[PDB]
Amino acid sequence: SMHVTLVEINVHEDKVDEFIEVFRQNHLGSVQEEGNLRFDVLQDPEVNSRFYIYEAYKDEDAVAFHKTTPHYKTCVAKLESLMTGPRKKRLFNGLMP
Amino acid sequence: MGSMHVTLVEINVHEDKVDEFIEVFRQNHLGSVQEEGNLRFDVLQDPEVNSRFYIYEAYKDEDAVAFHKTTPHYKTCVAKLESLMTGPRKKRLFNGLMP
Numbered sequence: 001s002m003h004v005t006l007v008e009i010n011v012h013e014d015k016v017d018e019f020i021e022v023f024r025q026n027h028l029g030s031v032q033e034e035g036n037l038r039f040d041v042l043q044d045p046e047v048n049s050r051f052y053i054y055e056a057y058k059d060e061d062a063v064a065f066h067k068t069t070p071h072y073k074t075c076v077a078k079l080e081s082l083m084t085g086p087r088k089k090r091l092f093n094g095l096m097p
Numbered sequence: 098m099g100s101m102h103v104t105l106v107e108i109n110v111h112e113d114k115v116d117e118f119i120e121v122f123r124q125n126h127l128g129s130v131q132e133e134g135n136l137r138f139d140v141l142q143d144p145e146v147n148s149r150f151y152i153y154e155a156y157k158d159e160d161a162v163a164f165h166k167t168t169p170h171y172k173t174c175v176a177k178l179e180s181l182m183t184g185p186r187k188k189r190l191f192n193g194l195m196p
Contacts, residue, residue: 004141027195042191096126096140
């Protein structure tokens with residue numbers, strides 16, 4: 001059904017707001033991609049500096065398209081100065097819907 | 098606290114019951130996406146462990162989160178997963194910011 005990834009991102013405490021602004025632009029573009037099914041931006045309820053991005057695409061070609069877009073490319077660039085460690089990704093097979 | 102309330106529920110089933118789990122859980126997915134409060138009830142499978150699933154349950158409010166657990170499809174699904182699950186479900190909670 002869907003190619004799904006949940007990425008955990010930890011950012012510096014003083015760059016929480018910057019991270020949300022940056023990711024807003026990635027969300028806004030990514031939800032408009034033709035093969036996008038979700039691009040949810042989640043925050044840990046206890047740790048204000050830890051975030052999870054829930055991305056779902058119809059297929060591999062869509063996943064791939066996503067990583068060529070200007071909104072993705074800008075995101076990655078603006079994120080380097082923000083993170084406290086490497087992102088932790090998990091892939092899933094989206095069975096339903 | 099969010100544009101939505103998300104619980105990621107991890108479920109692990111007997112290795113020879115992966116298909117039976119999908120058949121049962123299908124009906125909870127189909128009932129739960131009709132819940133007024135529901136925004137997602139995505140059913141995910143670990144690509145490396147076929148018998149490990151994660152349900153992304155996203156609701157508008159906490160009243161809806163609780164109401165889900167009163168429903169005939171939820172109760173039916175709990176009773177049928179008694180013989181399939183390898184132990185108790187595990188939950189992780191998140192606050193939605195977007196959308």
